[PDB]
């Protein structure tokens, strides 16, 4: 996480539940990354409790969520004068769903009493619409690449830990070394004995 500084327009952390000061010493046994694009005028929509057009329909954040979210400006990558139609979003659905799930089904929406039976007619429209973006928009309509970072604390053996090993060694001096948790003081001296690899 020391490569965190790469971009000048880098946006602030606004981490939820974990302070950025103590991420290095704390260890997470599993890191989950969720990346999808959000328009610039609902960048604050990703928060527990807060609802909207996308919060309860595409990605819901639970109250007991740990991790952080980040965003940056990418208006010169995913924007064209003709218009981008590769990105699609869901708009119509019956109700909200459980957090942490992926929905692929794109069946016809039911709004009226008479069913449409898959025919695009009255009281039934395609719920899947495109992200219409142009390079001449204002400060609130740029495509922002947003990745959601979540962790798990106390659920499995931990391997992901920050670097705490002092980045240097000692020869011919007694120091308070910390060898993977144990603390001791003594001079590191070469030994003529043979040590098995384990």
């Amino acid at each position: 996480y020391s490569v965190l500084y790469n971009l000048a327009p880098f946006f602030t952390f606004k981490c939820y539940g974990v302070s950025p000061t103590k991420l290095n010493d704390l260890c997470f046994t599993n890191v989950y990354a969720d990346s999808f694009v959000i328009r610039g005028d609902e960048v604050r929509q990703i928060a527990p409790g807060q609802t909207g057009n996308i919060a309860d329909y595409n990605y819901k954040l639970p109250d007991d969520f740990t991790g952080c979210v980040i965003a940056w400006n990418s208006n010169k990558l995913d924007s064209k004068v003709s218009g981008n139609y590769n990105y699609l979003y869901r708009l119509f659905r019956k109700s909200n769903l459980k957090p942490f799930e992926r929905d692929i089904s794109t069946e016809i929406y039911q709004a009226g009493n008479k069913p449409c039976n898959g025919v695009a007619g009255f009281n039934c429209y395609f719920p899947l619409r495109s992200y219409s973006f142009r390079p001449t928009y204002g400060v609130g309509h740029q495509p922002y690449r947003v990745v959601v970072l979540s962790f798990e604390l106390l659920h499995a053996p931990a391997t992901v830990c920050g670097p705490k090993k002092s980045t240097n060694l000692v020869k011919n001096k007694c120091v308070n070394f910390n060898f993977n948790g144990l603390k001791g003081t003594g001079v590191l001296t070469e030994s003529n004995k043979k040590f098995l690899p384990f």
Partner: antibody
Amino acid sequence: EVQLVESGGGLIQPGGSLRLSCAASGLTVSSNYMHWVRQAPGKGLEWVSVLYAGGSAFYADSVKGRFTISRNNSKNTLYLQMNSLRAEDTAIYYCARGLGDYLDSWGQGTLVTVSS
Amino acid sequence: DIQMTQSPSSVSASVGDRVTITCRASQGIGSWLAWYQQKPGKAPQLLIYAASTLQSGVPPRFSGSGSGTDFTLTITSLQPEDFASYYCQQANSVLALTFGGGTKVEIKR
């Protein structure tokens, strides 16, 4: 084939309680989005309230959440609760539905007049 | 704090004449745009749904499009039945809260 009707409006004292009714002909209220718009005399239309799928609703910034939305799927209608009426609240009310931040079909309208 | 005002306040034009109304936004909004026709005595009716595509039950001669913060609307072959208040509602992406003062058009005598 589709027509929206409103009822229950009339003269009411400030601070009173009244329930509006809006039934959709050929449409299920539990699925689509409904919108509420007001228009006081002398000025234009103004959005009032919107209903999501369930458990969440957003109101105007000037108001302090004085409308509560209750919907029953059995009767296919919508109910609103009047609370904390003021002199500015006197406006015409239109029953509206929306989709994709757009409005297509509006009702004939009902009148609510607060007489201080 | 949307801060939209429709200019000009009122215009006068007749059948065969040229008339247009411009609605601008203080902040940058996308290609989404809509127009409404508000006449007294009854509920207003919509004009278009998308940026350029029209409604099924509206005349095909209504013209209006835009890309930046400025939008405009005009009529090709004016009719006496299209004299009502004009309103603009482009987008808000969260709650669809945008509108202007309005503009009323009258026919000559």
